[PDB]
Amino acid sequence: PRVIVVGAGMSGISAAKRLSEAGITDLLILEATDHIGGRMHKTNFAGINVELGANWVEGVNGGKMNPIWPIVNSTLKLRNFRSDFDYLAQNVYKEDGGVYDEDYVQKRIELADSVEEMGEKLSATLHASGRDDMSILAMQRLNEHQPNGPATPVDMVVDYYKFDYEFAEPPRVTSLQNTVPLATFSDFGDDVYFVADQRGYEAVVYYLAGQYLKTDDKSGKIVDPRLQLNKVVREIKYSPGGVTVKTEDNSVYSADYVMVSASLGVLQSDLIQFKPKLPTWKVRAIYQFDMAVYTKIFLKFPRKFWPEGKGREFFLYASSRRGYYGVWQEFEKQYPDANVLLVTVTDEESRRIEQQSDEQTKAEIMQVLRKMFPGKDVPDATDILVPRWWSDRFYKGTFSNWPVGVNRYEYDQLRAPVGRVYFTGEHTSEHYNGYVHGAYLSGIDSAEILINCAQKKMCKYH
Amino acid sequence: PRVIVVGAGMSGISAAKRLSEAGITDLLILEATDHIGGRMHKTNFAGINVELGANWVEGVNGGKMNPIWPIVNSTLKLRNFRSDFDYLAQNVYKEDGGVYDEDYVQKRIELADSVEEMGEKLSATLHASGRDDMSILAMQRLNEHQPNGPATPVDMVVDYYKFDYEFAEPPRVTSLQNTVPLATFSDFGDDVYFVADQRGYEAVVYYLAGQYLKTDDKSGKIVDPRLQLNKVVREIKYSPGGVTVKTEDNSVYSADYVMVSASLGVLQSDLIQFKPKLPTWKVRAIYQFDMAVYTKIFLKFPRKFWPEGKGREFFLYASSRRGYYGVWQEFEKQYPDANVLLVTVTDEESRRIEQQSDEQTKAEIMQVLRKMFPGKDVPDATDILVPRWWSDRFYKGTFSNWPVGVNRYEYDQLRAPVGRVYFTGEHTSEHYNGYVHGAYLSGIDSAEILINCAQKKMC
Ligand SMILES: Cc1cc2nc3c(=O)[nH]c(=O)nc-3n(C[C@H](O)[C@H](O)[C@H](O)COP(=O)(O)OP(=O)(O)OC[C@H]3O[C@@H](n4cnc5c(N)ncnc54)[C@H](O)[C@@H]3O)c2cc1C
Ligand SMILES: Cc1cc2nc3c(=O)[nH]c(=O)nc-3n(C[C@H](O)[C@H](O)[C@H](O)COP(=O)(O)OP(=O)(O)OC[C@H]3O[C@@H](n4cnc5c(N)ncnc54)[C@H](O)[C@@H]3O)c2cc1C
Numbered sequence: 001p002r003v004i005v006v007g008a009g010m011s012g013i014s015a016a017k018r019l020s021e022a023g024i025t026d027l028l029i030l031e032a033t034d035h036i037g038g039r040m041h042k043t044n045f046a047g048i049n050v051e052l053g054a055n056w057v058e059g060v061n062g063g064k065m066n067p068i069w070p071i072v073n074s075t076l077k078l079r080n081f082r083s084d085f086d087y088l089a090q091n092v093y094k095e096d097g098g099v100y101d102e103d104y105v106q107k108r109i110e111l112a113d114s115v116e117e118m119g120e121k122l123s124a125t126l127h128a129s130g131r132d133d134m135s136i137l138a139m140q141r142l143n144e145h146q147p148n149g150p151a152t153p154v155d156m157v158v159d160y161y162k163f164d165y166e167f168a169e170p171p172r173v174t175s176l177q178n179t180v181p182l183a184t185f186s187d188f189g190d191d192v193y194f195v196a197d198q199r200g201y202e203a204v205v206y207y208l209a210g211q212y213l214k215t216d217d218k219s220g221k222i223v224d225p226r227l228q229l230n231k232v233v234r235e236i237k238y239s240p241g242g243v244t245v246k247t248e249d250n251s252v253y254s255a256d257y258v259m260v261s262a263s264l265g266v267l268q269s270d271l272i273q274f275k276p277k278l279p280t281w282k283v284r285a286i287y288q289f290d291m292a293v294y295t296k297i298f299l300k301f302p303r304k305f306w307p308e309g310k311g312r313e314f315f316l317y318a319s320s321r322r323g324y325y326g327v328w329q330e331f332e333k334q335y336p337d338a339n340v341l342l343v344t345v346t347d348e349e350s351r352r353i354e355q356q357s358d359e360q361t362k363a364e365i366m367q368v369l370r371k372m373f374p375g376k377d378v379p380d381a382t383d384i385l386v387p388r389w390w391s392d393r394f395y396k397g398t399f400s401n402w403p404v405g406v407n408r409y410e411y412d413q414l415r416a417p418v419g420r421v422y423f424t425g426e427h428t429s430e431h432y433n434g435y436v437h438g439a440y441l442s443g444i445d446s447a448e449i450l451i452n453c454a455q456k457k458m459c460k461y462h
Numbered sequence: 463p464r465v466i467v468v469g470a471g472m473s474g475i476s477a478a479k480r481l482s483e484a485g486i487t488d489l490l491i492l493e494a495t496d497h498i499g500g501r502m503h504k505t506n507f508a509g510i511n512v513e514l515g516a517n518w519v520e521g522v523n524g525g526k527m528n529p530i531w532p533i534v535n536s537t538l539k540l541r542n543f544r545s546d547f548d549y550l551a552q553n554v555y556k557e558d559g560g561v562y563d564e565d566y567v568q569k570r571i572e573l574a575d576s577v578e579e580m581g582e583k584l585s586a587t588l589h590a591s592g593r594d595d596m597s598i599l600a601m602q603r604l605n606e607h608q609p610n611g612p613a614t615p616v617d618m619v620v621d622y623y624k625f626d627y628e629f630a631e632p633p634r635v636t637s638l639q640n641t642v643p644l645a646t647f648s649d650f651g652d653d654v655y656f657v658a659d660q661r662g663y664e665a666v667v668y669y670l671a672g673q674y675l676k677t678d679d680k681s682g683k684i685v686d687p688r689l690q691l692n693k694v695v696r697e698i699k700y701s702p703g704g705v706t707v708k709t710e711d712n713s714v715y716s717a718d719y720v721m722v723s724a725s726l727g728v729l730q731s732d733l734i735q736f737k738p739k740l741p742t743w744k745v746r747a748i749y750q751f752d753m754a755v756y757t758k759i760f761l762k763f764p765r766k767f768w769p770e771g772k773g774r775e776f777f778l779y780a781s782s783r784r785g786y787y788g789v790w791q792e793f794e795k796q797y798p799d800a801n802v803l804l805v806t807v808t809d810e811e812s813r814r815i816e817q818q819s820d821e822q823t824k825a826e827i828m829q830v831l832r833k834m835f836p837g838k839d840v841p842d843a844t845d846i847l848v849p850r851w852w853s854d855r856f857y858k859g860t861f862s863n864w865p866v867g868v869n870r871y872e873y874d875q876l877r878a879p880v881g882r883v884y885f886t887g888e889h890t891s892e893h894y895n896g897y898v899h900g901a902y903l904s905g906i907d908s909a910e911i912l913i914n915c916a917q918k919k920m921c
């Protein structure tokens with residue numbers, strides 16, 4: 001059987017790998033960009049390679065092994081470090097300078113954490129159909145007994161840190177049942193490790209690809225003609241007998257099946273035309289799920305003016321404006337002496353920020369930093385990097401988020417195949433949507449459904 | 463039977479009137495503040511009385527008569543004017559100076575309207591169980607085929623004026639099924655009339671109350687001992703046989719039933735302790751519904767610097783920060799020669815602003831106005847009025863909003879009594895949650911439910 005796989009990010013490469021393993025080697029992987037890896041991609045910033053996209057292996061040291069971990073930490077030995085968030089309470093800055101008292105902050109953190117745990121108990125009891133789901137916010141109101149969730153500067157940045165910084169959308173839009181607790185942490189462990197290696201977290205993808213695609217002996221570049229880069233799929237025609245795939249440069253290919261791995265945001269943008277049009281139930285499922293945006297703004301300074309040392313890696317800015325330049329990370333271990341800082345924003349702020357100049361964003365950030373470190377001579381950043389994932393047509397966002405309103409059956413419709421057209425990607429992982437490991441596993445899972453149809457003639461889905 | 467009614471807002475007075483009409487006159491109305499009317503309430507600003515709460519009769523000129531209209535327009539003849547939003551396209555201000563091209567804006571408005579109309583068609587096909595409901599934002603993504611809803615500044619402000627200015631929360635939190643289309647307008651008509659009368663919109667409540675409570679013949683003031691002001695209820699104890707209600711000043715009262723009319727926000731706050739605790743089904747329904755906040759910030763200036771004239775009443779500021787001081791109104795008709803402007807904010811901005819001083823807010827607004835009118839010499843406002851409804855423990859918000867996730871059945875549980883404890887208020891209105899007419903009809907419906915149970919044993 002010939003199979004065309006659209007996209008060579010983690011899930012596509014992973015799916016193709018599994019097909020190869022089942023003996024399906026008549027493959028053609030069509031990648032839009034000039035490289036593989038997709039949302040795992042590094043870039044040179046001020047002389048160092050930093051990650052524009054995925055940066056952590058999340059879910060480590062628990063009851064089961066996250067499949068990505070051994071590759072990162074053993075097979076490839078990518079340089080990495082465990083993130084420690086235990087000292088946040090000593091690092092929350094006031095809108096107007098200096099940090100809050102540690103004991104005061106630790107108490108708000110403990111309250112927030114208690115509400116969430118009460119939320120995990122409620123969640124376990126909700127009907128599996130998702131019909132009784134509610135937003136994380138409704139659960140917070142219930143447990144704090146207030147007509148609102150966190151609303152003062154400190155509680156709000158603590159809330160953002162706890163939720164938006166992981167999901168990239170506010171608790172009020174997010175499904176309680178599908179995110180509290182989160183299987184990634186429950187199954188694989190509570191720790192996370194930040195990859196900081198010149199080769200990039202994407203090395204994991206190049207490694208998998210190399211297990212089955214041909215590579216150059218001296219350069220080690222993949223040279224297999226089954227992988228074709230710079231091929232943007234613009235149309236997929238499918239019928240009872242097979243499928244035809246057309247790219248922007250006018251190439252046309254045929255196969256028995258096609259596996260689509262493009263992000264949920266690409267699917268929501270109509271970059272790819274399906275003929276016939278996808279069924280209404282499928283379309284509705286595609287539009288109801290959320291494609292979030294998480295913007296890693298890197299900044300480079302001529303000298304350092306922030307604290308370094310124990311518990312200093314992560315710090316928060318308690319703005320009275322929720323989510324305004326709130327979560328900071330300093331790189332004393334990852335990029336020593338580079339004088340770089342990383343502030344993360346998401347959702348509304350990301351969209352605003354992608355739409356204006358980097359210079360304007362840099363000036364907003366400098367006012368924040370000067371308010372946070374009033375006693376220092378804070379020098380203007382000499383370089384800034386604002387990743388624009390929502391604006392990139394091959395991504396249209398950074399990762400999916402399960403909103404309140406999408407139920408279990410609707411989520412399955414999102415993953416379901418349509419005739420000979422199969423879907424894969426992080427947004428198709430039932431328990432790990434959003435993550436690199438969810439992309440990896442979704443590729444194997446989709447490939448298997450295809451293998452059953454193709455090899456065992458078991459073609460019915462659910 | 464003796465019935466205690468907690469709160470003298472529209473629904474409380476309305477319920478008590480309906481009960482009195484069924485002959486249940488042994489009533490005791492306990493109100494926390496020193497006056498009746500609740501969310502319908504005026505105040506003096508710049509030597510004129512303006513509305514801090516409700517200000518429009520909404521849904522007029524349609525197939526059914528909005529019960530409040532005749533009272534406002536005929537019975538009391540409160541001074542009022544129909545709002546015309548037809549010229550908004552001529553009045554959308556760029557973040558940094560002047561208005562956008564009118565044709566460009568009119569097309570953006572049309573596109574937004576069209577998407578909402580498709581949303582109305584879709585909403586009609588969803589199942590009554592709510593299993594296929596979605597947020598209004600989800601409907602916008604689906605109808606426009608994009609991974610996001612309105613996102614440029616102009617599109618966002620149009621989006622804000624079309625939804626947040628009515629509901630006080632963003633489309634992404636709002637139930638499509640239960641807000642588009644909205645019964646208020648579908649049933650009563652598309653027009654809305656702004657009340658600008660010195661007696662205040664609250665006069666409607668005073669009129670209803672005087673139909674059954676005693677008033678002084680000279681003054682006209684209510685003097686009936688069945689109404690007691692300054693009574694903050696803090697505890698309601700109930701048993702299969704009756705109830706006891708305790709107030710902050712330490713009074714204690716007994717009755718056969720209690721009708722609670724305090725806002726959903728107050729109920730989500732714990733100001734009132736129930737003993738025993740309300741059942742879980744009740745508690746969950748209470749916390750799942752939303753109590754929104756809509757802040758009317760009034761400003762007075764030494765002289766006018768904004769346009770006046772045809773189509774000038776309403777104007778928008780298209781900030782790149784969604785919802786930042788975005789919806790403006792000027793009162794050339796309402797308060798001629800007063801030099802007052804009104805800017806409205808909601809939700810996140812409302813909670814941030816209630817927490818800062820008036821001066822800080824004034825300063826923020828002066829920067830926006832200066833950006834809006836670069837050609838003028840914009841004087842600083844001499845006075846500002848920032849209503850703090852969310853911070854006020856007797857309201858904790860301005861009006862309910864229906865969030866995605868809650869279905870009709872769970873909404874109905876809000877209305878459900880618990881033993882002898884009955885509930886009323888805008889958040890219990892079957893199809894008009896959030897409005898004055900909804901608070902009004904809710905008091906009547908709640909009272910009839912209690913009448914049938916108490917008087918005919920049909921519960
Ligand atoms: C900023 C950011 C931060 C994140 N943080 C983390 C983190 O720390 N840890 C973690 O576990 N996860 C994180 N993630 C999520 C993680 O990166 C993704 O879950 C995963 O990489 C998605 O892989 P995928 O194969 O599902 O999608 P993709 O990587 O998007 O792969 C799809 C491929 O299809 C290509 N393509 C698109 N359209 C077409 C077309 N029409 N024709 C051909 N090719 C096409 C795209 O170029 C891409 O190569 C982050 C992602 C981002 C962007
Ligand atoms: C800023 C704002 C703008 C609005 N705009 C409009 C508009 O233009 N048009 C429209 O139709 N609707 C509008 N509304 C909505 C409308 O005002 C309300 O739906 C309606 O007045 C609510 O009446 P109610 O009786 O349900 O509640 P309320 O008016 O809240 O009455 C409840 C009463 O209970 C009292 N109370 C609270 N706690 C206690 C306690 N512990 N013990 C005793 N008494 C207590 C309160 O003081 C209050 O008097 C607006 C409201 C606000 C606040």
Ligand SMILES: *[C@@H]1O[C@H](CO)[C@@H](O[C@@H]2O[C@H](CO)[C@@H](O)[C@H](O)[C@H]2NC(C)=O)[C@H](O)[C@H]1NC(C)=O
Pocket residue numbers: 060061073074
């Ligand atoms: C990550 O990988 C490193 C690489 O080995 C692990 O460190 C080794 O662990 C074994 C287990 O006892 C030791 O015998 C080696 O001495 C360790 N090497 C070093 C350099 O310390 C490490 O434990 C792995 N981390 C996780 C979280 O799995």
Ligand SMILES: *[C@@H]1O[C@H](CO)[C@@H](O[C@@H]2O[C@H](CO)[C@@H](O)[C@H](O)[C@H]2NC(C)=O)[C@H](O)[C@H]1NC(C)=O
Pocket residue numbers: 522523535536
């Ligand atoms: C609101 O009330 C005014 C008060 O009458 C209405 O205006 C009158 O309507 C009658 C009906 O034919 C006319 O004969 C009078 O001449 C009108 N008075 C004025 C001053 O024009 C008005 O139409 C009402 N508005 C609504 C929406 O009901």
Ligand SMILES: NCCCCCCCCN
Pocket residue numbers: 056165166167179399400401432433434435
């Ligand atoms: N710290 C960044 C985490 C990014 C991974 C997406 C997961 C959220 C969706 N459940």
Ligand SMILES: NCCCCCCCCN
Pocket residue numbers: 627628629630861862863894895896897
């Ligand atoms: N434009 C002001 C409207 C206030 C009334 C609240 C209704 C919103 C909930 N349906």
